[model samples]
Target: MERLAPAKVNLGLSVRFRREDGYHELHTLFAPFSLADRLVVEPVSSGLHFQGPYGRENLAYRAASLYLEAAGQPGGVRILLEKRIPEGAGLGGGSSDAAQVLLALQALYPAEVDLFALARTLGADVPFFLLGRGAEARGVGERLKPLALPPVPAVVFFPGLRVPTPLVYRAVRPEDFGPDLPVEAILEALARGEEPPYWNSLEGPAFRLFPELKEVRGRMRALGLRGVLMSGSGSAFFGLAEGPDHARRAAEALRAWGRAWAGTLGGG
Candidate 1:
């Protein structure tokens, strides 16, 4: 089957604290988008085939392998993943791709495999894509509660730097984490039409690791977009605008830096 594996933007993220398991406790607002990667999945007679960078390290391949083992599926699957969502841009493309693989495989071959359990092993943000919409995510991004949010005009830009998520997280000093930005406040603010200024506790650490991202946010503000914030760890940032025209204009201007996309709040 064909699937449009959508990307997710972190509307707000709070790194509460580091747990004994070496995973940071998290509270985040995950916004899934129409902006997505395309993939074709079908059962095969042998081992998995995943076409993407980081080959064996690819999350899609790992997810398929894990699911096949966990479910004792009959055979392998071939995945043809075409990239649309930029990698390492804090866009959760890889994680989403991984989750989509699981979702598609499960649909093709129903089994009792613990999808959520499998998702958590992939990454913190992987589970959110399984939800397929807006969500208030917590507990290292495994715990999720579905949310409904109004669509707002926005633009997304990536500065061509693949900011390594693990590097950013490691650079995150405990002191950088702050008082939680409650998901309720962020949702309420967006519900009231507040633009551009959502909270991302990791932005502090992400900026420190890559100053260019800080400049990206500054550029967005200069372009007159409100609620300018980096989506997640770094590299890609989205800004809120008054309308599509405004967002398109800003995104057009931003293309000089890197690729830019103009769209609404949840879907692009």
Candidate 2:
């Protein structure tokens, strides 16, 4: 079976509070885009075989291991990943890859594992990828409320830098925390054809961690892309465009800067 693991962008992210469990309580809007990684899975005779970057340490590999272990399936499987989404770019590439593996395992095993529980163990962002749509995510991103959002044409730019999510989170102090985004209002704004009120609480710390991010963002704005914002913790940034053609043109303009993609967000 083959699956496309779509990359996601956090439209509005608010770090609400630090919990005793070490996970920060968060409220964020997640929007999946057309940029995705491809995964091909097939049931094999015995042991697991995976071909991809990061080898065994990859989240997708761990996902397959956890699924087979819990399912206790008689046969193992081979997974081949063709990665397109950039890692550590706040694009949720790895999480999406892992989620696709879990989905494939579920289909192969038929009736075996609790998918939600398994996905949660993989990572906070994994659950959202399984949802496979735009959503309002809370409680460390496990609690998701699906949102019916329209397709939004946009372009994404990766500045060839990898920002560690943990480092950005650690750098966030009490002063950096912010109020949760009003997701309903944001949705309404999008529906009304207005610029959604998008914001990211982690932007300050992420920009500080990688000063180059700020320059990239400035260049994006200077290029006349509207509603420009860093997708998640850092590194990759996206901007809303007028239409698909506009998005493609804008992405072309960004090529001189770094890696860029033209696509739509939230059309499911």
Task: Identify the leading candidate in terms of TM-score.
Answer: 2
TM-score of every model versus the real structure: 0.87, 0.92
Name the runs in model 1 displaced over 4 angstroms. Answer: 18-23, 173-175
In the range 19-133, model 2's lDDT, one tens digit per residue, is 9998888898889989999999999888899999999999999999999989876689999999999888889889999999999989987765888898878875888888888
Model 1 error, position 72 (Å)? 2.6
Model 2 scores a TM of 0.92
Residues 165-187 of candidate 1: C-alpha lDDT, one tens digit per residue: 78777777788776666566666
Per-model lDDT: 0.81, 0.85
Query: Largest lDDT belongs to which candidate?
Result: 2
Worst 10 residues of 1 by lDDT: 189-198
Those runs of model 2 whose alpha carbons end farther than 4 Å from true positions after fitting are 20-23, 208-211
